[PDB]
């Protein structure tokens, strides 16, 4: 089973709250949509919070280990194992949190999406450059930039070697 993890970062590889964009910028939610369409969605709270709504074609899991948080036309998990125990039987899963949620899941992870913005944000999370001895990039896109997204953003795809 694959194990995607995405991010969100600025020019300086700086993350902003929870591993969210900030002002309503829409740029990583239309791609984690985009992306995620046909396989498990695993959002931290706060991610999914800031969406709002369970994104439709596609199962919606919460990882929290809030054991009285309850959501409608969504999976809540408690920890990594309930997460996997859910997903034993998908070939593949997207996982969209924070920095929390990405240490927790870190030795599992096959594939890093990263979606870099052209565009200094404020953000208390650095994400470390990639150590590409174990690490190969898979392909970049440039992002679509319009009215709703101002900013020049590529997505970096890698893929874990060994």
């Not at 309503?24 to 999914?48: A, C």
């Not at 150590?131 to 679509?144: A, I, P, Q, R, Y």
Request: glycine share 6%; proline share 5%.
């Amino acid at each position: 089973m694959i194990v995607s993890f995405m991010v969100a970062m600025d020019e300086n590889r700086v993350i902003g709250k929870d591993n969210n964009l900030p002002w309503r910028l829409p740029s990583e939610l239309q791609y984690v949509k985009k992306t995620t369409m046909g396989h498990p969605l695993i959002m931290g709270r706060k991610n999914y919070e800031a969406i709002g709504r369970p994104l439709p074609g596609r199962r919606n899991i919460i990882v929290t280990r809030n054991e009285g948080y309850h959501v409608e036309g969504c999976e809540v998990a408690h920890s990594v194992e309930e997460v996997f125990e859910l997903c034993k039987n998908e070939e593949e899963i997207f996982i969209f949190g924070g920095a929390q949620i990405y240490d927790l899941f870190l030795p599992y992870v096959d594939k890093l999406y990263i979606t870099k913005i052209h565009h200094a944000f404020e953000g208390d999370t650095f994400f470390p450059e990639m150590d590409m001895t174990n690490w190969k990039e898979v392909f970049v896109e440039k992002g679509l930039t319009d009215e709703k997204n101002p900013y020049t953003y590529y997505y970096h795809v890698y893929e874990k070697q060994q």
